[PDB]
Amino acid sequence: MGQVLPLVTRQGDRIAIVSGLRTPFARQATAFHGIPAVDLGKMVVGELLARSEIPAEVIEQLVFGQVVQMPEAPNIAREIVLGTGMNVHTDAYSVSRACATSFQAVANVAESLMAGTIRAGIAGGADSSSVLPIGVSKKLARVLVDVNKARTMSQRLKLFSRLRLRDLMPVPPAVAEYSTGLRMGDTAEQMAKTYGITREQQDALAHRSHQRAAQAWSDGKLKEEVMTAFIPPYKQPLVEDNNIRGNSSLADYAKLRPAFDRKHGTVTAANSTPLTDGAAAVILMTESRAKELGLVPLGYLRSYAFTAIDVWQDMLLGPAWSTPLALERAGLTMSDLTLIDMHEAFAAQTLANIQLLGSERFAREALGRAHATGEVDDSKFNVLGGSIAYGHPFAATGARMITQTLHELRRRGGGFGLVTACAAGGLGAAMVLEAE
């Protein structure tokens, strides 16, 4: 039967997206230094309520997922309300799903007001690479575990005898998988070597993404969904992202040594997302209540999909797998897709995706579909640049694209927007956006 999932509530009201906002991104060891990710979420949601002029007590649930969490604050969502002017009776909780925490936050909040258990939701995310919850070595942790249970003072001295000068150094942060140990750069390289990705076209994507984003900022199109962050020192405000290098050349890109595979790697810092900190917040209202309170829905929500893949090889094929499922649930096709957006974690993995999305062989056997998904037109492909530009703040990546996509389809006809993003652990996310 037709596996179509039109996102309308029990009353038949479809799910809308009334507005959205994003905190500007900045590099690590910059203005965004020493700031816990809890503060970013509190700051962004405080202004958005004022900007959206909607009362705080109306909203009935908040979900905020963050990477690089702080163990002191396990549930960030509760402390956001405790820190901001959100109503105490908020029924909020936090999630965590790779870099697609926002997409997961979008997924469960949208289905939350689907069931009628609540009536309003706001989604977002925040992460910061400036501060690290660096921990002690596990054995050193175990040494302190046993001494706490010790009752005799003389027993304490004998129990700390198990010590070494190698134990005192802390554990620096890393990104390698728990059960695999492969970095994303190692992943991005293996598609480049296997499928075949030349650095010239890979760095071309980075240049084009940089220029398209740089052109977008100069035009000021992505100015209404980017606020001006304030720092508690209040030395200078940041209005525009410092990550984008709008004055760059392809010859400048070609003189970068490979970082991950210094022998045959075809990815560099030019064609890879750097470490940025930021946040975003988006309000999700069903259409029945959006008209009730007198707000225009900044688009709507049509369908969504998530598909999982293997963790040992081809971990970044989530957009290849998740995208076909969303279109069938939305009952749509790439042909009638005005704008397409996808996460450009690496240039090598990006060009592979369109290559694999254009690969009939991959769809017929790996996906089992009768035909391939479709073609990705470069004109509609990442018009305002992509992830190789603003940055990859982990949680805010999912929310950032939706605002710009809805804003861009607002600048154009109705159409059908689409966002896809790969994730660690063989995870992928995809959905189709309406925007009238």
């Binding site: 059960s179 293996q190 070597k193």
Partner: protein
């Protein structure tokens, strides 16, 4: 196409040549006489063009790169000429290859044994995949042979004198990870980029301009090589007992290659093939190799088998946990354990823990996969959850009614698809079934002393047993690393039946005032591992003897041991290693050295007389009873095939592999000639040495049980 052979040459746009080895016939990549000549034509064509810069060898086969020399090819040899001539043509083959000035690179993936490393050592560089199936070694000594050429002289010069010697002798397996550490392979690369990673290595300007140094250069030269060879030669001769050839030969051929040059090792190893390729031990090891491979290829039954994915075991303790560990940890099949006492499950699950995680202490693996192995072993006290069990294992006491009660209830408390397996000691399988609503899928296995050391099991069906049940049961042993033999359902079975006179005769000759230490050493020098008494106690005196009355009541009194002296051991708390006191001192308080037996068994033994019987006589009398029972047992076709009879005995009891097997020994010793020498023993000692009926038949007229080709 029968003319392309397997070596096909291919040159890319760059000045390199890629070589594929695709055998048109069998999947495994073997070596014949025609490959040796055609590759010389290929390399001659490669020599004429000066534009090239390197060559890379590709498996072009998902199974293996090159398996090694074909064993039948050695089997066609008749005199020392062919072995040396094949050796002679082998030397020039790689020497011509090694004479090339440009870089030669080999990409290793799949398997590489015997003649496989011949090409690898003939190439300046080699690259191997990290796929866990690739391996390097020289499995020639176990076949009564040695590496074809160069292995005893160039490899020690390339990998080290101490490192190379043990691999040739021990014939161990070398993995990809430790191959790079030792230095044989320059780099380890993923299989996806195996060929591409070999591209840049061929482009290297230096074929060999800076060889790696030897950290063990201390004994390099003549200062310690002779001292090493003297010690290991003493070490080898003691471990090999002196009854195995090609053991001191390796030391000699390694010595001549290392001392006075490589070409000297060429002739000595060629000379070694003159005798070692044509040796009764060599044919014995080549014959058992073919026999062992035949039974593995043999599927036991003819009907297609039945699905088997969930395994239940009725009994824990120690023996019950043995099957579960092999079924789960090795075969990767979940196992459920049921017992009436949780301590039975406790012991089995704990015993699995104790035997496992020892490699963890040796860093052979990590705990990430250990939990999964434990996840396949489940224990329970109820029948609930057994409804999805495809096969069930009975590992409890051999009471017939208790077995009949459980087989009826498990038939009641499980689905019809589940088949029945029983590890009976001496009870008949059909008698065990009896009142079974589903007898056609009732089969009997027979395990032994802990099965992580015992390398085979028994397939023991009764009268009503569907060929599907045999097919499932026979194929059950294969994935367990066991040799399945289909045997006739008779009291005492086949392996258990023949060992009863062996332990009977040992006890009979023990009581007549003979010292155990000298007679035991004489029997183990014959080629038998483990002596009679030490083998008898650790396996279970009660378990082993429990079949003897069944042997007695079925065939005759030849199985009965001298009474009132063997039974005295049973009711004296002297029950072997399990009971903590028996025969040998088991505390091992002599710095864990060779302890002498307990100086209290002799007063309990009659031990009247002296040694009397000569050392060669006691050893042969032990194998006569094995053969006398073997000729009698398979006379009524207790074994499906003669080869199954051979592999049942030579691989389960410990018959000297250099002798080949039971009827390998019979044919070797003049066939009916042995028939004469047993009758005089019958007149000397008693009627237990009477010749078998068909043994007389073959002896009187002159026959060999194996026509085959001669």
């Amino acid at each position: 196409m029968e003319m392309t052979s397997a070596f096909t040459l291919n040159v890319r746009l760059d000045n390199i040549a890629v070589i594929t080895i695709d055998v048109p016939g069998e999947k495994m990549n073997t070596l014949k006489a025609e490959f040796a000549s055609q590759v010389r034509a290929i390399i001659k064509q490669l020599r004429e063009n000066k534009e090239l810069r390197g060559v890379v060898f590709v498996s072009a086969k998902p199974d293996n790169f090159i398996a090694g020399a074909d064993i039948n090819m050695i089997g066609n040899c008749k005199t020392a000429q062919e072995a040396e001539a094949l050796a002679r043509q082998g030397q020039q083959l790689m020497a011509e290859i090694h004479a090339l000035p440009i870089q030669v690179i080999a990409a290793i993936h799949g398997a590489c044994l015997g003649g496989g490393l011949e090409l690898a050592l003939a190439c300046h560089g080699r690259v191997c995949t990290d796929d866990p199936k690739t391996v390097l070694g020289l499995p020639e000594v176990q076949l009564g042979l040695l590496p074809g050429s160069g292995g005893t002289q160039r490899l020690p010069r390339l990998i080290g004198v101490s490192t190379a010697l043990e691999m040739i002798l021990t014939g161990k397996q070398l993995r990809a990870k430790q191959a790079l550490k030792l230095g044989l392979v320059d780099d380890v690369v993923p299989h996806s980029i195996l060929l591409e990673a070999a591209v840049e290595l061929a482009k290297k300007e230096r074929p060999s301009s800076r060889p790696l140094p030897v950290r063990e250069r201390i004994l390099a030269g003549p200062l310690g090589r002779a001292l090493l060879f003297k010690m290991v030669g003493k070490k080898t001769e003691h471990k090999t007992q002196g009854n195995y050839p090609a053991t001191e030969r390796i030391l000699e051929v390694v010595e001549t290659g290392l001392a006075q040059g490589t070409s000297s090792g060429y002739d000595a190893e060629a000379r070694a093939f003159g005798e070692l390729a044509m040796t009764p031990q060599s044919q014995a090891l080549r014959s058992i190799f073919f026999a062992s491979t035949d039974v593995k290829k043999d599927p036991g039954s003819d009907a297609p088998p039945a699905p088997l994915n969930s395994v239940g075991i009725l009994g824990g303790g120690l023996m019950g946990g043995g099957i579960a560990y092999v079924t789960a940890c090795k075969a990767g099949i979940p196992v459920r354990i049921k017992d009436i006492n949780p301590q039975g499950i406790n012991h089995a699950l704990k015993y699995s823990w104790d035997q496992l995680e020892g490699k963890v202490r040796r860093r052979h693996l990590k705990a990430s996969e250990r939990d999964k192995q434990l996840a396949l072993i489940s224990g329970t006290t109820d029948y609930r959850g057994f409804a999805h069990r495809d096969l069930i294992i009975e590992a409890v006491f051999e009471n017939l009614e208790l077995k009949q009660q459980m087989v009826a209830e498990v038939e009641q408390n499980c689905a019809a698809h589940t088949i029945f397996a029983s590890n009976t000691s001496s009870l008949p399988i059909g008698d065990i079934a009896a009142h079974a609503t589903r007898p056609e899928q009732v089969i009997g296995l027979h395990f032994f002393s802990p099965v992580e050391k015992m390398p085979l099991v028994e397939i023991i069906p009764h009268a009503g047993t569907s060929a599907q049940t045999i097919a499932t049961t026979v194929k059950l042993a294969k994935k367990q690393g066991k040799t399945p033999i289909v045997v006739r359902d008779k009291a005492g079975f086949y392996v258990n039946r023949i060992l009863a006179p062996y332990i009977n005769e040992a006890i009979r000759m023990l009581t007549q005032g003979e010292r155990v230490e000298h007679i035991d050493a004489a029997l183990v020098k014959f080629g038998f591992p483990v002596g009679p008494i030490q083998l008898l106690d650790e396996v279970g005196i009660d378990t082993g003897t429990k079949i003897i009355p069944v042997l007695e009541a079925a065939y005759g009194e030849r199985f009965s041991a001298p009474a009132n002296v063997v039974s005295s051991i049973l009711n004296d708390d002297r029950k072997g290693r399990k009971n903590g006191r028996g025969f040998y001192l088991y505390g091992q308080k002599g710095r864990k050295s060779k302890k002498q037996v307990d100086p209290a068994i002799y007063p309990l033994i009659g031990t009247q007389g002296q040694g009397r019987i000569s050392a060669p006589q006691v050893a042969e009398r032990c194998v006569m009873l094995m053969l006398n029972e073997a000729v009698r047992c398979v006379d009524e076709q207790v074994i499906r095939s003669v080869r199954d009879g051979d592999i049942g005995a030579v691989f389960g009891i410990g018959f000297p592999p250099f002798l080949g097997g039971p009827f390998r020994y019979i044919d070797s010793l003049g066939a009916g000639e042995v028939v004469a020498i047993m009758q005089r023993l019958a007149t000397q000692y008693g009627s237990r040495f009477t010749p078998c009926e068909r043994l007389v038949e073959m002896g009187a007229r002159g026959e060999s049980f194996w026509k085959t080709t001669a």
